[PDB]
Amino acid sequence: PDWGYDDKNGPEQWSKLYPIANGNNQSPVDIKTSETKHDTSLKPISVSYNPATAKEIINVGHSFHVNFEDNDNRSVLKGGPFSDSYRLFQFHFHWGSTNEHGSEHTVDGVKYSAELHVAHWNSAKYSSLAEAASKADGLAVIGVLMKVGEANPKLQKVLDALQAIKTKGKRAPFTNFDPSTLLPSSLDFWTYPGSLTHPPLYESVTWIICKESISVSSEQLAQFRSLLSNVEGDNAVPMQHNNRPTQPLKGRTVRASF
Ligand SMILES: CC(=O)NCCc1ccc(S(N)(=O)=O)cc1
Numbered sequence: 001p002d003w004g005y006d007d008k009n010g011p012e013q014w015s016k017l018y019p020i021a022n023g024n025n026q027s028p029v030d031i032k033t034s035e036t037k038h039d040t041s042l043k044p045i046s047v048s049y050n051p052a053t054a055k056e057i058i059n060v061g062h063s064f065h066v067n068f069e070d071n072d073n074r075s076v077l078k079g080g081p082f083s084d085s086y087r088l089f090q091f092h093f094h095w096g097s098t099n100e101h102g103s104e105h106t107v108d109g110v111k112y113s114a115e116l117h118v119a120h121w122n123s124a125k126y127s128s129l130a131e132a133a134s135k136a137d138g139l140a141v142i143g144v145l146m147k148v149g150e151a152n153p154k155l156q157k158v159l160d161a162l163q164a165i166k167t168k169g170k171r172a173p174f175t176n177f178d179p180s181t182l183l184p185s186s187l188d189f190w191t192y193p194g195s196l197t198h199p200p201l202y203e204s205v206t207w208i209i210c211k212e213s214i215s216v217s218s219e220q221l222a223q224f225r226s227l228l229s230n231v232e233g234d235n236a237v238p239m240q241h242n243n244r245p246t247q248p249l250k251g252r253t254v255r256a257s258f
């Protein structure tokens with residue numbers, strides 16, 4: 001690919017190939033609680049995922065994705081700022097070179113160790129992910145900040161699967177899993193209109209950032225960093241990091257459900 005997280009092909013240089021990187025609806029962003037606006041029209045977040053939709057886990061070079069079957073509404077996200085139903089299609093993480101950084105979104109300047117992203121697409125208005133991905137109201141992603149501390153047992157199935165997709169391109173069956181088990185006990189959230197955090201960087205994402213963080217141990221993060229970005233047979237190249245710096249709000253308003 002023509003982009004990555006290294007010095008020459010990283011976030012700082014993405015604008016060369018993808019001009020939208022300097023757009024007015026880019027993500028992630030720094031959430032300043034003193035500037036958030038509480039909206040009473042915001043309904044509670046509602047997630048209902050069917051574990052049978054879990055499909056496959058793939059090493060995509062810069063990260064790894066856990067995909068779900070999205071042929072029907074067995075796994076959907078509703079409520080919040082949405083009137084339409086969004087269909088689950090994938091969840092993945094972002095992490096940094098060390099525990100002191102790793103999350104993409106930050107709160108009042110505080111950076112966390114990693115971030116969980118659960119993505120969905122608008123199946124009420126569109127017919128496929130490919131179609132919805134470029135629409136302003138096409139995607140919905142739940143972001144959960146991960147604070148380094150106690151080991152998170154609910155990450156077990158995911159971590160145990162990494163040994164089967166160590167190098168770029170490898171993929172394997174990942175079934176019978178409900179990602180709602182990874183979300184925090186409280187679903188209070190912040191929401192704002194944004195974009196995909198990496199190329200193609202489409203400004204088609206309605207972000208749902210959870211107020212409550214979930215835990216993850218130093219060793220579990222080490223597992224993410226032990227994944228290889230190279231293809232099998234080549235010199236090992238660890239996936240040290242894949243988080244984008246926060247971008248200018250550009251007049252956007254971050255709303256709070258609490
Ligand atoms: C084919 C496919 O699923 N590609 C990944 C698309 C994609 C999904 C979500 C995000 S994020 N970081 O904004 O949550 C970025 C890219």
Ligand SMILES: [Zn+2]
Binds near residue numbers: 092093094197
């Ligand atoms: Zn992401």
